[PDB]
Design a protein around this ligand. Structure first.
Ligand SMILES: O=c1n(-c2ccc(Br)cc2)cc2n1CCCC2
Ligand SMILES: N[C@@H](CCCC[NH3+])C(=O)O
Ligand SMILES: [Cl-]
Ligand SMILES: [Cl-]
Ligand SMILES: [Cl-]
Lengths: 151, 151
């Protein structure tokens, strides 16, 4: 199950919304800037994600996206099991919180290199996914999925 | 090195532009709809791509993008070797052409399920990357990159 599990996360900066998908087992992320977190924006984001990686399960970021007919339609279309994001394990909240703080720190470090926030966010995605902690998140996700394919 | 080689491709539909990146060894793709193919749009697309996969070399789709200072700046930022896309092997032009025709066929098959072209394009990316040819393009890219990380 673990190779296909992702978590949605919504954070705010500069009066805008940054929508993040985290591959839970690796820490690998994809992210986008949107005007506001609507069902239509979340649905489209999930469609993109699932065309790019083998997304089996998504823990949604809030109850509005869990309820959304548009989000449910995208999950149906893309073969995604839509689940809640209730942190039954309480360390999940702290991990997400730490991630948002770290992403915002990186955005700050690149902000002056980017005219638009969306460029800074994608620079932050790049830096995060390439950072060695020794393997990177990008290396870990590929290894996890490749091992799963060989089953 | 083949695991890191991508090719840019620009095709047109409904008076709009579809920008495609193909992982040459696997056939895996990412794509976006843009109003027009500018250096700024191409640069941003490459930044996104390189944050998500280990992009070493990009064969650019035309001379304007090869020349573009904005595209060159993004390639510099993201650690991408920007190359030309001259088909020294002539089978390349046919492979790209066949890809565009197939993508447009899939878009036609889903078009009525999508209000906006961009949704149809992402549905086509999904269908293409999951199609078993027996492995899918999505499976092939992960295997190729995972083997490269391990060797
Ligand atoms: O590195 C991260 N993150 C993460 C993602 C982005 C940033 Br920026 C910081 C941490 C989230 C997780 N992991 C590892 C596995 C648990 C989930
Ligand atoms: N396969 C090589 C790279 C190791 O390290
Ligand atoms: Cl919002
Ligand atoms: Cl949208
Ligand atoms: Cl154009």
């Amino acid at each position: 199950s673990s190779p296909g599990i992702w978590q949605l996360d919504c954070t705010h900066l500069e009066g805008k919304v940054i929508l993040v998908a985290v591959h839970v087992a690796s820490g690998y992320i994809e992210a986008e800037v949107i005007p506001a977190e609507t069902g239509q924006e979340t649905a489209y984001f999930l469609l993109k994600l699932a065309g790019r990686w083998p997304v089996k399960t998504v823990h949604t970021d809030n109850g509005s996206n869990f309820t959304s007919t548009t989000v449910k339609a995208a999950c149906w279309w893309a073969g995604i099991k839509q689940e809640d994001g209730i942190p039954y394990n309480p360390q999940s909240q702290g991990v997400i919180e730490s991630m948002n703080k770290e992403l915002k720190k990186i955005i700050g470090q690149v902000r002056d290199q980017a005219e638009h926030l969306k460029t800074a966010v994608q620079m932050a995605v790049f830096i995060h996914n390439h950072k060695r902690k020794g393997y990177s998140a990008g290396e870990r996700i590929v290894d996890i999925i490749a091992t799963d394919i060989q089953t």
